[PDB]
Amino acid sequence: STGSATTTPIDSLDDAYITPVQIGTPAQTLNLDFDTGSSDLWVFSSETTASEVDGQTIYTPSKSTTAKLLSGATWSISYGDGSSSSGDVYTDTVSVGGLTVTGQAVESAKKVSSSFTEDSTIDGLLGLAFSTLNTVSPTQQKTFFDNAKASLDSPVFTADLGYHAPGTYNFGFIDTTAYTGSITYTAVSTKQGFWEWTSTGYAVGSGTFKSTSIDGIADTGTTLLYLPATVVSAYWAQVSGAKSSSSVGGYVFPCSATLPSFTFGVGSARIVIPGDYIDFGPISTGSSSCFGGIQSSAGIGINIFGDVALKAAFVVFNGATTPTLGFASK
């Protein structure tokens, strides 16, 4: 089997991407944020505290003939930005882009934190990291990909995120028309539950490539590119007037700037992030200070190749017995 679904930016900045997902019988379509940095499929629901729902589409398990309470199971998760959600669990039929999994754990939110409530565009998350990170207790549950894998033509999914445009998540096949050149594959460590890999270095603009190992995660659920302070300082030093602002919470730059590109290494291959991808616009409406899309990972504890990086590539998440990651230009 295979699946193919379009993923769409939630706003003009590509702050996140949403992908329609069919849950239950008859189908209830919710727009979920596919997150290769977590492993829970959770949704706004008929169980979500009413005051914490503001415009999201909800899953109502009582209206699904295939929903079953997973008795005793609870979940609770926090994300890198301090947001969180928790609740109980149903199993139900879940389809993405024509690919169907029966008996998928659908984690129904009883509580969500304010930043979820305040974002009406995201109806939940669909985790695509390794199932060892799944938070369901006392019986840990498998991700949609883990459940689908044995049925897929090939045990892979691909992320092809657009810059200010829709893109595609495919399951079970590699669309050879969706990228240019060849795909370069690189080793993955699953020891922390992430798609963790080591970049071979970087360049800023037209500068020389610096060969240096940068361990990090391929994370579709993080907006920005978070890298070591040394790397980030070298990038922003090439932008007149750029500075790190403790009050704003990262590097800002004059909105009048033209940003340089940023290149990262994948083995001997190179992925170029155009400068425009690194512009996250005014820090507040009407401001002439703009927020940078490359930020320091110092304090996070891990480097994160988030959407800023991934959208510059066609990315293969290879879930074979020994997982790997592939990157191609596009």
Ligand X SMILES: N=C(N)c1ccsc1
Output 113 or 238, the one with its CB closest to ligand X. Answer: 113
> Does the protein bind ligand X through residue 153 (CB under 6 A)?
no
Binders in 214-243 for ligand X, by CB under 6 A: 219, 221-222
- Please report which helix (H) or strand (E) contains residue 289, including its range: strand 289-292
SS percent in the chain: helix, strand, coil, step 5? 10, 45, 45
Q: Is 14 an interacting residue with respect to ligand X (CB under 6 A)?
A: no
Measured CA to CA, the distance from residue 149 to residue 86 in angstroms comes to: 26
Contact 128, 36 (CB under 8 A): yes
Instruction: Spell out the residues 6+ positions from residue 201 whose beta carbon is closer than 8 angstroms to its own.
Output: 209, 210, 211, 212, 213, 214, 264, 265
Q: Least distance in Å: CB of 208 to ligand X?
A: 31
280: enclosing H helix or E strand: strand 279-282
Nearer to ligand X, 122 or 316 (CB): 122
Contacting ligand X within 22-81 (CB under 6 A):
33, 35, 37-38, 79-81
Cα–Cα distance, 262 to 225 (Å, whole number): 10
Give the nearest distance from C-beta 150 to ligand X in angstroms: 25
What 8-state DSSP symbol labels residue 46? T
Cα-to-chain-centroid distance, residue 39 = 11
Choose the catalytic residue: 35, 123, 146, 279.
35
CA angle, corner 97, sides to 26 and 119, nearest 5?
A: 80
- In this complex, which beta carbon is closest to ligand X, that of residue 64 or of residue 134? 134
Nearer to ligand X, 32 or 67 (CB): 32
Catalytic annotation on 199? yes
Q: Is 134 in the site for ligand X (CB under 6 A)?
A: no
How many residues of this chain bind ligand X (CB under 6 A)? Answer: 16
Q: Which of 86, 95, 131, 199 is catalytic?
A: 199
Whether the CB-CB separation of 266 and 200 falls below 8 Å is answered with yes
Which H or E element spans position 33? strand 28-35
Cα-Cα end-to-end distance for the chain: 25
Q: For ligand X, which stretch binds (CB under 6 A), given 47-55, 112-120, 254-262, 307-315?
A: 112-120
Site for ligand X contains 107 (CB under 6 A): no
Stretch that binds ligand X, among 43-51, 115-123, 259-267, 280-288 (CB under 6 A): 115-123
Shortest reach from residue 328's CB to ligand X, in Å: 22
Q: Which lies closer to ligand X via its Cβ, residue 116 or residue 277?
A: 116
Site for ligand X in 159-188 (CB under 6 A): none
Which residues are tagged catalytic?
35, 199
Q: Which residues bind ligand X (CB under 6 A)?
A: 16, 33, 35, 37-38, 79-81, 83, 115-116, 119, 122, 219, 221-222
